[PDB]
């Protein structure tokens, strides 16, 4: 393998330099379901949570 900077210069030749490397990956996403209700039809003014601040 090889490793590059953003410009495309080779930073490491992982084989020629007697190195080793480990790679990790994951995939996710999230969403909030703040549907319309009668209690507050102004959507900009609904949120199903609140907070304490200073």
């Amino acid at each position: 393998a090889v490793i590059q900077d953003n410009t495309g210069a080779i930073i490491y030749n992982l084989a020629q330099q007697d190195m080793t490397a480990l790679r990790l990956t994951f995939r996710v996403g999230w969403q909030v379901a703040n549907t319309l209700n009668n209690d507050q039809p102004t959507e900009a003014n609904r949120y199903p949570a609140a907070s304490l601040i200073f």
């Binding site: 549907t35 319309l36 009668n38």
Partner: protein, 43 residues
């Protein structure tokens, strides 16, 4: 030539669209007066 690629957009439509019902639907309030006042029929 170099720079072949079967990109996501070139590979599109061999994959389906995906849809879920999980947050459809909505409960209702019951009316006040019909629940609270004394009912009477009329002709």
């Amino acid at each position: 030539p170099y720079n072949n690629l079967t990109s996501r957009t070139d590979a599109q439509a061999l994959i389906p669209e995906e849809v879920s019902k999980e947050m459809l639907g909505k409960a209702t309030e019951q009316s006040a007066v019909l629940q609270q006042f004394r009912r009477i029929p009329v002709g």
